Amino acid sequence: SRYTHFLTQRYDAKPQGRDDRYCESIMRRRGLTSPCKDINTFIHGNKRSIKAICENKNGNPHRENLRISKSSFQVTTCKLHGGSPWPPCQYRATAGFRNVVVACENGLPVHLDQSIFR
């Protein structure tokens, strides 16, 4: 439930571009444009690795009740451009590659900490 919603909001397995136009498309596809979300980051790659963050084989405890990954992931950060509060929402894409901070419930990721992505 919260896991499927995490994936919806935060996981794109195999993107192609990761350019501005990619962000604008996926923010709409995934229902993050009512209202226009200020910033959102998607994790790429394989799903079992992200699940693994909630175990000891890919995660460490972090701050208050979070977990931070041992391995790095391809990520894309979509940053709202030009103050649109409601659609059409315009976005600027920054691709990166780093470890990720999540929260886990019942051994599955359910929240992504945006703050590590500026």
Author numbering: 4 to 121
What text appears in the publication on this structure?
ANG residues H13, K40 and H114 (part of the P1 sub-site) correspond to the catalytic triad. In the crystal structure of H13R ANG PD variant, the substitution of H13 by Arg is very clear in the electron density map and the overall structure is largely the same as with native ANG. In the native structure, Nδ1 of H13 forms a hydrogen bond with the main-chain O of T44 and Nε2 makes a water-mediated interaction with the amide nitrogen atom of L115. In the variant, the Arg side chain stretches out into the active site pocket making a direct interaction with Q117 while retaining its interactions with residues T44 and L115. The interaction with Q117 (known to be the obstructive pyrimidine-binding site residue in ANG)642 seem to result with slight rearrangement of the C-terminal helix. In addition, in the variant, the Arg side chain is not optimally positioned to interact with the two other catalytically important residues K40 and H114. This provides a structural explanation for the dramatic loss of RNase activity observed in this variant.
Angiogenin (ANG), a 14-kDa basic protein is an angiogenic ribonuclease and member of the bovine pancreatic ribonuclease (RNase A) family (also known as RNase 5). Like RNase A, ANG cleaves preferentially on the 3′ side of pyrimidines and follows a transphosphorylation/hydrolysis mechanism. In addition, the crystal structure of human ANG has revealed that it has an RNase A fold and the catalytic triad (residues H13, K40 and H114) is conserved. The enzymatic activity of ANG is several orders of magnitude lower than that of RNase A towards conventional RNase substrates, but essential for its angiogenic effect.
